[PDB]
From Swiss-Prot, chain A:
Protein name: T-complex protein 1 subunit delta
Modified residues (Phosphoserine): 18
TM spans (from-to): none
Self-association and partners: Component of the chaperonin-containing T-complex (TRiC), a hexadecamer composed of two identical back-to-back stacked rings enclosing a protein folding chamber. Each ring is made up of eight different subunits: TCP1/CCT1, CCT2, CCT3, CCT4, CCT5, CCT6A/CCT6, CCT7, CCT8. Interacts with PACRG. Interacts with DNAAF4. Interacts with DLEC1.
Record's disease association: De novo genetic variants in nearly every subunit of the TRiC complex, including CCT4, have been found in individuals with a broad spectrum of brain malformations, and clinical phenotypes ranging from mild to severe epilepsy, developmental delay, intellectual disability, ataxia, and other features of cerebral malfunction.
Subcellular location: Cytoplasm; Melanosome; Cytoplasm, Cytoskeleton, Microtubule organizing center, Centrosome; Cytoplasm, Cytoskeleton, Cilium basal body
Residues binding ADP: 35
Binding annotation for ATP: 35
Species: Homo sapiens (Human)
Residues of the full protein shown: 19 to 60 of 539
Family per similarity comment: Belongs to the TCP-1 chaperonin family.
UniProtKB/Swiss-Prot annotation, chain C:
PROSITE patterns listed in its UniProt record: TCP1_1, TCP1_2, TCP1_3
PANTHER family: CHAPERONIN
Entry function: Component of the chaperonin-containing T-complex (TRiC), a molecular chaperone complex that assists the folding of actin, tubulin and other proteins upon ATP hydrolysis. The TRiC complex mediates the folding of WRAP53/TCAB1, thereby regulating telomere maintenance. As part of the TRiC complex may play a role in the assembly of BBSome, a complex involved in ciliogenesis regulating transports vesicles to the cilia.
The protein, known as: T-complex protein 1 subunit beta
Taxonomic placement: Eukaryota, Metazoa, Chordata, Craniata, Vertebrata
Molecular function per GO: ATP binding; ATP hydrolysis activity; ATP-dependent protein folding chaperone; protein folding chaperone; ubiquitin protein ligase binding; unfolded protein binding
Annotated positions binding ATP: 37, 91-93, 488, 493
Organism: Homo sapiens (Human)
Keyword ATP-binding listed: yes
Database matches in Pfam families: Cpn60_TCP1
From Swiss-Prot, chain D:
Pfam families, A to Z: Cpn60_TCP1 (PF00118)
PANTHER family on file: CHAPERONIN
Organism of origin: Homo sapiens
Cellular localization per UniProt: Cytoplasm; Cytoplasm, Cytoskeleton, Microtubule organizing center, Centrosome
Protein name in the entry: T-complex protein 1 subunit epsilon
Curated annotation (Swiss-Prot), chain E:
Species per Swiss-Prot/TrEMBL record: Homo sapiens
Function, in words: Component of the chaperonin-containing T-complex (TRiC), a molecular chaperone complex that assists the folding of actin, tubulin and other proteins upon ATP hydrolysis. The TRiC complex mediates the folding of WRAP53/TCAB1, thereby regulating telomere maintenance. As part of the TRiC complex may play a role in the assembly of BBSome, a complex involved in ciliogenesis regulating transports vesicles to the cilia.
Phosphoserine PTM sites in chain numbering: 4
Coiled coil: none
Entry protein name: T-complex protein 1 subunit alpha
Family: Belongs to the TCP-1 chaperonin family.
Disorder association: Intellectual developmental disorder with polymicrogyria and seizures: An autosomal dominant neurologic disorder characterized by a broad phenotypic spectrum. Main clinical features are developmental delay of varying severity, intellectual disability, seizures, and polymicrogyria. Additional variable features are non-specific pyramidal or cerebellar signs, and visual impairment.
Compartments it resides in: Cytoplasm, Cytosol; Cytoplasm, Cytoskeleton, Microtubule organizing center, Centrosome
Residues that coordinate or bind ATP: 35
Amino acid sequence: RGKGAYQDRDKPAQIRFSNISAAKAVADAIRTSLGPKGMDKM
Amino acid sequence: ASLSLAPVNIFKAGADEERAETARLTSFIGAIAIGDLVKSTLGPKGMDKILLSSGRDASLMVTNDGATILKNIGVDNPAAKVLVDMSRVQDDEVGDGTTSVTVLAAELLREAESLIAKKIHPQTIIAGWREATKAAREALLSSAVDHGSDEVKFRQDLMNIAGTTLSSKLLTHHKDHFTKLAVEAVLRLKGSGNLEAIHIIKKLGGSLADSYLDEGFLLDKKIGVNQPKRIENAKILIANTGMDTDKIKIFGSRVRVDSTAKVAEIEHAEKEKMKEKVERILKHGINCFINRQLIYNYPEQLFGAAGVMAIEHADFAGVERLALVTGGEIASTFDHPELVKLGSCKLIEEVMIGEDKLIHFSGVALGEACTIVLRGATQQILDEAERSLHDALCVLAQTVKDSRTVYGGGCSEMLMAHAVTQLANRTPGKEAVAMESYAKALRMLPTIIADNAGYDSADLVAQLRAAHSEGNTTAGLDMREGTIGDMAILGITESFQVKRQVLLSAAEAAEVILRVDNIIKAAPRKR
Amino acid sequence: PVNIFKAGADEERAETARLTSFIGAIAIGDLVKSTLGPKGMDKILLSSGRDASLMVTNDGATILKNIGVDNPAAKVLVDMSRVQDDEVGDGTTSVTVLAAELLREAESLIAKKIHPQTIIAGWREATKAAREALLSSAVDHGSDEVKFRQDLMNIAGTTLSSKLLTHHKDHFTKLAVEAVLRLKGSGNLEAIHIIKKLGGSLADSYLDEGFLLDKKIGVNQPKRIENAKILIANTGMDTDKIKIFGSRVRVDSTAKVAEIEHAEKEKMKEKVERILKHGINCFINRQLIYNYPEQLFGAAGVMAIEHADFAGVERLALVTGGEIASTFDHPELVKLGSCKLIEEVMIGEDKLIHFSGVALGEACTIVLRGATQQILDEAERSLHDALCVLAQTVKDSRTVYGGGCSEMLMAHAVTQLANRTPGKEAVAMESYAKALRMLPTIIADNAGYDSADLVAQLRAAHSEGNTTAGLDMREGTIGDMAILGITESFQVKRQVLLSAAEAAEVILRVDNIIKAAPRKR
Amino acid sequence: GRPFLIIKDQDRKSRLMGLEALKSHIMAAKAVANTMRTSLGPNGLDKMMVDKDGDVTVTNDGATILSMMDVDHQIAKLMVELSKSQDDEIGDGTTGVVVLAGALLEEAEQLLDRGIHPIRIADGYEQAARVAIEHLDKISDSVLVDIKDTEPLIQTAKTTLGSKVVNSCHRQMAEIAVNAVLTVADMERRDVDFELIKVEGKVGGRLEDTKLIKGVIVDKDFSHPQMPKKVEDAKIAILTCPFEPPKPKTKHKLDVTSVEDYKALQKYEKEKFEEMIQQIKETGANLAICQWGFDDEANHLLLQNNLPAVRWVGGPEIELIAIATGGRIVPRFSELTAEKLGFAGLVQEISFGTTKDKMLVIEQCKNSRAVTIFIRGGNKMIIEEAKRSLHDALCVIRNLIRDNRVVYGGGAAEISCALAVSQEADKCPTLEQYAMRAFADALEVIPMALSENSGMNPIQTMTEVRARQVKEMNPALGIDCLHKGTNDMKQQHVIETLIGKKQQISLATQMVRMILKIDDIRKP
Amino acid sequence: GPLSVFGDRSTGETIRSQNVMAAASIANIVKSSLGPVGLDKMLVDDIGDVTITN
């Protein structure tokens, strides 16, 4: 393809991965909240 | 993907890391700090600084060359340590251009950070600089010229290079008084290294003009009473023997007697054993003596009974120098009074040097090792004088080793820039901009030289690019004034080997430091 | 050689001061350079002492609004962005990044020991020439309705590229256009109403054919009215205190007090009948009202609306054809507001009163049924910016070319000037021109294209004289926006360049930063 | 019942158990694997780091990087241990195996959130490693290496130096390494001990100076610096005792009851000295190789005897001199004879010019057994980098002592093994296809990170290369390692070890199977 | 972690077991005040008020 933009910027990758990882964390935390047999939280 | 901090603490106290452009920023900030710390001193009109310690008598030493500067300072970023180490390596190799290689590396990294800010694959830059440096090496060797076919021209080139070195440091202020003198010293080398064979003596006071190289040899010790006070045409034998206690090689021996008369007998026996040893040595019939170890009181009295000159304990370097200059031997066995060669000299006598005493050794057999007398207004002057002259001696020895030289500073640089530019014309694709950035990086050096001089830079660089583009490969910046002139007549000859080595080392260090991707500091070793 | 400052008072009178200013400026520039072009990505302003208040924004105005600094130059640029956003809208990003590039040029120039006044004069002349050239290229329209409408569509569509709402550009840009049509050539900005109602989609939003009100109604008011004769009032109606004071009730029996109460009830009824003499089917009260007036109005049976808003009543007086009254002796000297139907509407989970078939439609009401409060806030910011741009382009009909077209035009003009200029200034101006070249470059960087190739092609095209050449952001090619439809406001770019010029002028002429000793905190 | 102290000091007592412990494991391990990404195999960068005492050391020899870290979590220390194991086994893929492990545990954490016991994942990984190694052994090609042909080995080392800065010269090192291995190898035993090679380096010079010396280097100068400096072909002797008179290793008290005893001892001292001189001069050996130093009398006597010698020479260097010279060890002059002497090719003194070091080399005309490698470069960082790189190269050659020790690498092996794993896994019942497919994905992780490190557009690169190597089957179609097109690896010829990749696969599979099991945790 | 910082969390039958913990606890105290026949328990306030209850 030839040389070009090396994408020397990857901090936005760290922020995006951090946010999405936190999102899976918070979503996983309450995965026991719904269902006709679901459990609840106090 | 790049993420090593969000999940959990994978580090103990004081342990961190930085993956993204932050690491590059840190390294480049350190590198530019190094460069400005050093680029403010490069060039024949380069500048000077002062290194001051933190407490503890505040060690003071003046220096122009940046080697000791990077040694003393506490560099923090790993790239900074890498730079100070490349500086120490270039310093040990030859010297007088360590500053140059440091500045060149820093400036290369400046264009490197710029181009990576233009989002470029580092491997491409590395390959481009490798090919460009190979081509530049070939061109510069093609420009290398051999000499030494005669004496007058070669000697003139030696004074030229000596004075050129003296420009980079402070010695320029009296460089003439140094130059020819220095030449003579390198003449006495006659095909051997170990500058330690060259001796340098400093005493506060006098003047730089008062400094001179001895027309003979010098020694700094003291002599006994029963020894004479003035001698000539001495015959010299060197020794490294134990004559203080006559310690017998067997340990465990002990006297088991009862009457103290036997003790007097055995002590007289020991004294006569020492007397017979002195007879064994004196059987060689030497006129002067040196022993590497201590001359004890009984040996000294026996020598005084003989009444000849004997020199007490000294070092290894002194005895080696004396063996060189007089052609004696360091003897530790004396059953062969005629199977040894005696050192030769013509006059040995003290000279009251101001507030000091030094013995004058004229008419020595071999004029190989030499003693240099230094005097100055401050001891810092003496320290930097010795440093700079050691650098000059290293360069002189290196150019005696190989007589391949090139034209003066920048001009060889600028023609290499011209050749690399011509390749840039031949260079297609993306590597072309990297290697032309390499080229202007090289071209930056004479600009900094002009800035250190105190003259306009852009006009000189553009005009001299025009001059070197027309084939006038001998013109260049004038050393006397901010003008342009041929250094062949001006007399600026540049040692090809030293700066080809400088270019190679700078290229290697730059590519190594550019190959980085990640800085991870470990713990600070909690106290 | 002697200390002269107070504890905490600092003065840097060397290049370290400009160094600090420049690094702060660069820290400003890179933070916002990701919010430009059609490829921008939004940012977060996270708080910890503000009780965890966050706002997401793309136009860097709010970004510079919510961040302070000790380096005074960065605050200077923050105020510059304030000014820029005070003028029209988006371009704060543009002017700030441009200032960053020009100060980087200044860095490179100071790297050659040059007295800055030469730079100052050269940039003065370059700016004069560039403004003259751009004015000579000022393309104008409005002589035709279709041409002017399409120019507005092009400007709006190009502007929505810089923000999020592009996803439904055809459902947004065009809509915004009609809003400024409703201004009827009036210079007012404060007629458009901004409404945020979380829930629903940005495509579920719409522009109603009327007006809406969000205030409680009286105790007994009809729910729907037709052909409403509308009046707007601002008086007491709260047992209508006499406004006279230093007067006291001082009697010896309470029968007189009873008669006074009966008399005040009668006087309030008299005020009500005074109002009713004019004859209306809908009443408006900017403020509250009391139970007895409410009973009187219910006896009348009309619509009384209570506790309205000053700006809103001004807007509605502009809209429905009436004006606010406070005295009612003249059933003959007042113009009455008019509407077709006034009904009830339930939007989100909030209750609104709907004006349908209003006699006029000057003011505007934009309901946003978005999906989050933060997206709603940034949507309202973006529409505010877009309507400001629309109003400005309606004001002055002259337009210009974006995609770097006008930018490389001035770049090449300055190039030729520097070529015909001797001295350092030329290359400085050339570098200045190079500085301008960085602006479209960063745009391509937002796209991540073959940067140098594109820049070379644009410079070649502008040297050839193709004065409509631009960058295709749909694919990464070079084309003509006259085909594509990428047009912007002449006023916008003109003031962007002029403000950037004067900001550079003031910033470069600094020599010593002195931070006073902090008071305390 | 009121809570009561059952466990000693439950106050400072921290317990984790269950799926959350696995979450902590996976997150830490993914962070580490992504930390160690950008040095993959034939092409990459180098990570620089400083340790506690302030030493700069940079390389892609990943084991060193992981070793010199003051890490906190246990799994990372386990990773460091695995890296050290793989380095001491082969010396390449020091980051490849850890990135593979990270990929495997990525797959494990994905499938974990699907609600399956870790035993299933470990079993799937084990079966997939079985299949992968089996096919990797089916695909490797035997290399017929003899004592006169070296070009395949030269290209092997040349490719191995990829991503390792020593690829500057990239040619001479392969030749000198092959020559050293041939000289020192024990062919019948197939054994090469690296204690026979004095891997040395000195700063300065250039990487062009990287040379192999068919002999020994010694770092001690003349006992008599005035003595003549260089000798051609010579005969040496190795004496393990000084020149001092023989005193026993038992405490001895030699009485002296008479003056004539004093005369007898002062005569016997010298008599022993010159007796030793006559003994050593009779045997005719030019050189003496001692260990403990001696007295100046011997120095001056040898000056009058013109017989060179050295002193204080250390143990291992003494042994290496003896090995190279072909002689035997002479404890004392009783064993001294003309037979056991060692013949010298030529011996010379250098000082590296500007330096004040002194260093003697021994180059042998006759057959030698212990060779020496010298390095010239930019700094101690350069010296250590060259040392570790060439040492890993020697490990590679020692592995390569046998045939079929090479398969096409550069990532192509990863595509091939991933394809084989997918093909085998597809024809299986359920509950296993998921784990096996996960292993397959972990397999093509390596080419993805490879293309990333090269800076190539990754996903299209892997797609096109996979299509090319699927439609026509060959072990040589890997992605561009020299980045110049010609992805057919029968042209670039990435020539790297078989057992290296096999051991990396085995280590990663066993290690992930191990880590999958730690489900309940306890810290203070 | 789960992004529930500045606090504490628990789960499993353990906490369900701990749900027994307090409850069964409060049983034992009152375990001598049952129906027809029981024994009274003594309470002393911080002020020291003397109080009895059954």
